[PDB]
Amino acid sequence: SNIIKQLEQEQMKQDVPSFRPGDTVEVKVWVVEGSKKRLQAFEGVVIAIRNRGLHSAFTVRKISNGEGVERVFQTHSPVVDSISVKRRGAVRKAKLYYLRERTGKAARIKERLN
Amino acid sequence: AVQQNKPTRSKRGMRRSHDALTAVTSLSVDKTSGEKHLRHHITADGYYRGRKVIAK
Amino acid sequence: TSGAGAQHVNRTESAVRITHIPTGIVTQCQNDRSQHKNKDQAMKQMKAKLYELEMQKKNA
Amino acid sequence: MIQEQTMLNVADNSGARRVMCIKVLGGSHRRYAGVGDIIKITIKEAIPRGKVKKGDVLKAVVVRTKKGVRRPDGSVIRFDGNACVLLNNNSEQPIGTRIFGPVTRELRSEKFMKIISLAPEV
Amino acid sequence: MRHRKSGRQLNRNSSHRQAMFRNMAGSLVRHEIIKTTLPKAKELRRVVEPLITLAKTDSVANRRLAFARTRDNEIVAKLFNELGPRFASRAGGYTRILKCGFRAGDNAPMAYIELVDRSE
Amino acid sequence: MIGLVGKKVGMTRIFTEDGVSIPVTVIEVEANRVTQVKDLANDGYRAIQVTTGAKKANRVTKPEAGHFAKAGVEAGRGLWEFRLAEGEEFTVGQSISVELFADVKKVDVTGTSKGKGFAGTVKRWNFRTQDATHGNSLSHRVPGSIGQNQTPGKVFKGKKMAGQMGNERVTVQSLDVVRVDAERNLLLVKGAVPGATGSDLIVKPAVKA
RNA sequence: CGAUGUCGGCUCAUCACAUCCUGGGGCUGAAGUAGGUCCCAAGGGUAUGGCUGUUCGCCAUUUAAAGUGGUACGCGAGCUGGGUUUAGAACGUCGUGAGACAGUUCGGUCCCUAUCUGCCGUGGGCGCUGGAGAACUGAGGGGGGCUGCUCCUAGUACGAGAGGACCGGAGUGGACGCAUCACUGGUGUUCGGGUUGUCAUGCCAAUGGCACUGCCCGGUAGCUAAAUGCGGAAGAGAUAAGUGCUGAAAGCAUCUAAGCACGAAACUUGCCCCGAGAUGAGUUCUCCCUGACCCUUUAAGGGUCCUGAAGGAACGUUGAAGACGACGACGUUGAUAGGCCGGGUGUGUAAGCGCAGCGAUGCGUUGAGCUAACCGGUACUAAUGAACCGUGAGGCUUAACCU
RNA sequence: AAUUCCUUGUCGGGUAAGUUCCGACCUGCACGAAUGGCGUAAUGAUGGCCAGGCUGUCUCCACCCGAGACUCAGUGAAAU
RNA sequence: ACACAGGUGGUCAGGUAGAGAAUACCAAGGCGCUUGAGAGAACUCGGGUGAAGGAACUAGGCAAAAUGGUGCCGUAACUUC
RNA sequence: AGGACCGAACCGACUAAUGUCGAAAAAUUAGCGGAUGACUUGUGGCUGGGGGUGAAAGGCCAAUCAAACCGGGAGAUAGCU
């Protein structure tokens, strides 16, 4: 209702870049490494996007050294400093969960470049 | 699942104390033809709340 | 007792286990119908098994 | 969410290739082990010249799960495979000398410092 | 326990129930009054009312969506040509549930449902 | 001290600055105007009763309308009654608001929970389902045995059986207050409170503190 | 013996104390840590697997601990049927033989729609003394009661060193329980798309039916848990064993005889829910009704005319309430449901047209189109004026009162 | 051992753990040569055991779709 | 014993897909099974899907899930070849 | 060629669930074995009660089998209820 709708949009950040699933996105996340407050990087493929306003979240699959890591990010959290689109991908599906069995040359996806 | 001995006509009768029908007591009178119907149901001729709504 | 023939094998506590805690050898008996005979057989069976643990104590 | 009979992979080069989980340690009647919890494993496969061999019973700390850990901000870090680093049942500072693949931040507590210093990521 | 669930199941599976309202919406268009049971009438409003809102914009794509529903070419011609511009002024609620006794054969609550013009 | 009556408005979350997202329940607390004050001179216990919100003129009866004009208050939906705790004193009409909870730190929330209907023994009392196979005839989710034999000859009273679950007053205790928002008339407790969205909630401070 | 079905497993338990863990102590051949033994104590708790039909048991690995028992060796109108006790068949063995074996072995139909008690729920009646609408006090009843590890105290007390505390204080788990759906997920045959085979819409294009929802990829709201909040307490009272103080009988000694103080998860409270059918039926607030009569076995009697109050029910729209009743909201002096408008979500670039390519198809219009249960709003549709149940100042005896 | 009582014989294999299985020993209660002995490729809705894949079989159940159950109307039983 | 989910010999055999009289959808022709209306509890029945695990279930992988076609490549011990 | 192989009609009946006052006095659903043969089926014959028939279970011989059914000896006999 309007009580919650008011209470949520006072809290949402207002600079979120418009990204689509399939985009290679480098999400840059605060991490507390003991005493120092480091900002580290996470660069993978956006395989899913949840849109709920303040509760919106996106899941980024990164194939790291060894096996793949599927980290999801709460979008309006203060832990995510910078979301930055590196490469734009041309899929035609809102959820890329077929990409979990596909590895390597079958896992690569199409550039948009339109 | 079977009875051990037959119940009386007393114990048969008390179970049926809740089985009684109710009279509706809520017949209305139409605005135009003045005829009996239920609440929110059309009349036998076809009037409802004064208007000949069924034309039949 | 473990066996078959009736539920006579599976109603009465007719077996016996005599366990010797200064050694740790388990003498058992299910041979008879009556517990008092099984306990009498298993007691003599363990005194034979206490002979052999004292023979093997000497022989070692 | 690692429980009884779970086959896991191995992160370190101790020699084990597949291990199976036989027990979750700490707290009786416990369902499953999680982020960095200690388990008794048994070794179901080994390389020929490992530090351990097949059919040895020893401990392990879970370092990756497919169920995935949760940070307090709401975020969840999931993996494509269960993995663990092997221990000694009596003396800590785990067996391996390299650690393959990433580990997670919640493993950083005072005794797995050897693990998060050898791991190439996180 | 159907907390906050619309739709009446009506002792039919999802194939049968979709096929009967597809027929029954064609009956309400073609005769402009039909007699049915009262739970089937109140679920018929959730079928016929979006058709008449679809029929406001007379375009070829709307002619094909109102043919994908009701699968009838005579109905999609009584929509968009007769029922289309006749309810173009009204903002929803094109229908009317008038209750009428009970069904004689099984004691079912019967109801007339009709479009709100019938000024033929 | 006393507590207040409010209405539940969904759930949200509060991203705190330190990298923590804490889930909150938005409880709107309007002005709780007092309708009657009780004391030992007339009643034997000292307490107040308050009312909240608004009602329509025709829906309120004649006995309930003459009870509100006695206080001089606006007619409000229902009446709840709070036991006073020997240190405070209120008057008839003192418009008690959400300013009381800026003092407190942890609260107790009481509301009528969500009703599940006639719930079975697996759902209501957390029983183990029997085996789905291996011969099992018509006896998967059934409760099993309910008593022993001839020597009890009965089922003991209080037996965990199937029936009405939910739709019942429950109190989740010791919930943290996150924000007391007085301009918006909002209380933000931490976590989950009973009942559906729009139900009533009796928020009082934590007795176990 | 005109039939009380049986070993073990499963589900569900319940009680006892002769206590396995936790709690309180005495003594120690008790330095500490960890014990050992005994006393008190039943509030909660008290594994998972391999083998075996097995109960047991041994083995593996845990746990604060894996208590002993009773309840037809609890529990088959609750399930199973592996075992043992029908008929088949074989082995060893016994017998000349039919056949037999607490010898072994392979195969083998487990019926019941609940009348009564019991129990779990949820209602109708009438009662509670004029009728109602609420909010309550609380008699009484139930639920809950587990615990590890880590750090501080303190590497101090103790000890030759090794080792390593009592008592306090904090965090964080396991198991359990309750609540909820914000998160993460499940589901989502009422949403969107892809696609196979075929049939139909005259045909092309576009669609729809059927094939397990045809197969599928996603997915709203609900419900849900693996998810996320919370709980167990503190405190008080009287004690158990135990420890005492003063103190005689009994010049001393002595916790007891008189007197006085401590002492546990047990007990009564505290915390949570039900609850005045608590027939002992309670209190508190507000609302409503103040008209004439004849009769007679004048009685707290019966009958008529007028007058229908508060409130109820009924019906209708219905609800995150619900098997049905019930409870909750709304009924036009109106947002209760559906429709509708805007928005959100979901799926993912609709059809039509145009260009490119021989064509499949790509591209542009275009994040387009459609979008259920959602969010805010809007009387368009349906909630009708009413009629009906409930009446017309409410017993007697006393007392204290004003009158 | 379809045979072995004592017996879960002992040893090896397999398993974290194996009263079953496999191999070996022989102390055969009570194998044994057409009431056949011992091997045996193929075969078996055959007895036992192991492994892979696969899974609501289970940890531990959640949701959904239908048929009853429930309510209304019509007819209307049964054991006892 | 019934207007009973059973039994009952021969003959004819269309279209598209298919190896086919299997199977799906259809033609000709025949039918909707002689109680319905709601609601959308527990529970039962017939199904669908499932996070993480993967036989830990159990007498026993019982039941379910899975495997599934054509063409080609390849194919072990053993063997009565 | 084949008591060959996979697989419908046809014949059968291994598992499980339902059913157990059933739809049915052994069936349904989902799987399962054979499916050119010691195959299966139609029609009509033949063998009979201490008898038949039996790729043998004491199986079958009209929902009846270690001696069928109907009548009769017959009101068998019953120290039993």
- Give the residue from A78, A77, A75, A67 showing the smallest Cα distance to A25: A75
Cα–Cα distances in angstroms (integers) from residue E75 to residues D76, E19, E59, E89, E93, in the given order: 53, 16, 16, 21, 19
Cβ distance of A3 and F28 shorter than 8 Å: yes
Strand G, nucleotides covered by protein (CB < 7 Å):
6-7, 10-14, 46-49, 52-55, 58, 60-66, 71-81, 83-85, 101-105, 110-124, 132-138, 142-143, 148, 173-185, 189-190, 201-202, 206-211, 213-214, 217-219, 221-233, 270-274, 283-288, 310-312, 314-323, 329-335, 338-341, 344-352, 363-364, 367, 369-376, 378, 380-388
D76 touches chain A (CB under 8 A): yes
- Are F25 and F11 contacting, i.e. CB atoms less than 8 angstroms apart? yes
What's the gap between Cα D99 and its chain centre? Answer: 11
Nucleotide nearest to F135 in CA–C1' terms:
G80
- Are D13 and D100 contacting, i.e. CB atoms less than 8 angstroms apart? yes
- Are A44 and A23 contacting, i.e. CB atoms less than 8 angstroms apart? no
Amino acid at E71: R
For this PDB entry, the determination method is: cryo-EM
Residue E8 lies inside a defined structural domain of this protein? no
Residue E100, SS3 per DSSP: strand
A16 touches chain F (CB under 8 A): no
The CATH number covering residue E26 comes to: 3.90.1030.10
CB of F118 within 7 Å of some strand H atom: no
Q: How many CB pairs under 8 A join E and F?
A: 3
Tokens of A21: 């699933």
What's the gap between Cα A9 and its chain centre? Answer: 20
Describe the strand order of the beta sheet including F47-51 as a list of residue ranges.
F33-38, F47-51, F80-83
- Give the residue from E25, F189, A66 showing the smallest Cα distance to D120: A66
Instruction: List the domain range (segments joined by +) for residue A105.
Output: 1-114
Cβ distance of A72 and D76 shorter than 8 Å: yes
Residue E1 lies inside a defined structural domain of this protein? no
- Are E67 and E54 contacting, i.e. CB atoms less than 8 angstroms apart? no
Q: How far, in Å, is the CA of F131 from the C1' of nucleotide J34? A: 37
- Are D43 and D56 contacting, i.e. CB atoms less than 8 angstroms apart? yes
Nucleotide nearest to F119 in CA–C1' terms:
I42
B54 touches chain E (CB under 8 A): yes
CB of B21 within 7 Å of some strand J atom: no
- Are A90 and A111 contacting, i.e. CB atoms less than 8 angstroms apart? yes
CB of E106 within 7 Å of some strand H atom: yes
What distance in Å separates the CA atoms of residue F27 and residue F191, rounded to the nearest whole number? 12
- Give the residue from A68, A71, A75, A50 showing the smallest Cα distance to A60: A71
- Are E53 and E65 contacting, i.e. CB atoms less than 8 angstroms apart? no
- Are F2 and F48 contacting, i.e. CB atoms less than 8 angstroms apart? yes
Residue F196: count of CB within 10 angstroms of its CB: 14
Residue E75: count of CB within 10 angstroms of its CB: 21
Contacts for E28 with CB less than 8 Å, ≥ 6 apart? E34, E44, E48, E95, E113, E114, E115
DSSP labels, D38-70: EEEEEE--B-TT-SS-TT-EEEEEEEE-SS-EE
Q: Which chains have 3+ CB pairs within 8 A of C?
A: none
Expressed in Å, this structure's resolution amounts to 3.1
What distance in Å separates the CA atoms of residue F36 and residue F54, rounded to the nearest whole number? 17
∠ Cα E78 E81 E87 (to 5°): 90
What distance in Å separates the CA atoms of residue F49 and residue B36, rounded to the nearest whole number? 49
Residues lying close to strand J (Cβ under 7 A), chosen from 102-141 of chain F, are 135-138
Contacts for B55 with CB less than 8 Å, ≥ 6 apart? B46, E118
Tokens of D31: 């369902």
- Are E78 and E63 contacting, i.e. CB atoms less than 8 angstroms apart? no
What distance in Å separates the CA atoms of residue F60 and residue F113, rounded to the nearest whole number? 26
Instruction: List the domain range (segments joined by +) for residue E97.
Output: 13-115
- What are the phi and psi torsion angles at D117 (to 5°)? -95, -25
**Pick from A65, A69, A73: which is nearest to D75 by CB?**
A73
Q: For D99, which DSSP code?
A: B
- Are A60 and D58 contacting, i.e. CB atoms less than 8 angstroms apart? no
Burial group, residue E13, by CB count within 10 angstroms (0-12, 13-18, 19+): exposed
Residue found by looking up tokens 């059309």 in the block: B42
DSSP labels, F19-52: S-EEEEEEEE---BEEEEEE-TTTTSS-EEEEE-
Residue E3 lies inside a defined structural domain of this protein? no
- Are D119 and D104 contacting, i.e. CB atoms less than 8 angstroms apart? no
Residue found by looking up tokens 């959730």 in the block: E46
DSSP labels, C1-60: ----SSSGGGTS---EEEEETTTTEEEEE--SSSHHHHHHHHHHHHHHHHHHHHHHHHH-
Residues lying close to strand I (Cβ under 7 A), chosen from 41-100 of chain D, are 65-67, 82
Q: How far, in Å, is the CA of C33 from the C1' of nucleotide G1? A: 27
DSSP labels, F77-115: S--EEEE--SS----TT--B-GGGGGT-SEEEEEEE---
- The residues spanned by each domain of chain F are 1-209
CA A20 to chain F, closest CA, distance in angstroms equals: 24
CB of F123 within 7 Å of some strand H atom: yes
How many residues make up chain B in this entry? 56
Helices (H) and strands (E) in chain B, counts: 1, 4
F interface with A, Cβ–Cβ < 8 A, is: 9-10, 12-17, 19, 21, 26, 28, 184, 186
Helix axes E60-68, E45-54, angle to 10 degrees: 160
Cα–Cα distances in angstroms (integers) from residue F153 to residues B1, F142, F147, F161, in the given order: 17, 21, 8, 18
Tokens of F85: 């705790």
Cα radius of gyration rounded to whole Å, chain F: 23
Residue found by looking up tokens 């093997």 in the block: C56
Residue E104: count of CB within 10 angstroms of its CB: 8
* Total domains in the fold of chain A: 1
Q: Which CATH class is domain D1-122?
A: mainly beta
Strand partners, F27: F8, F187
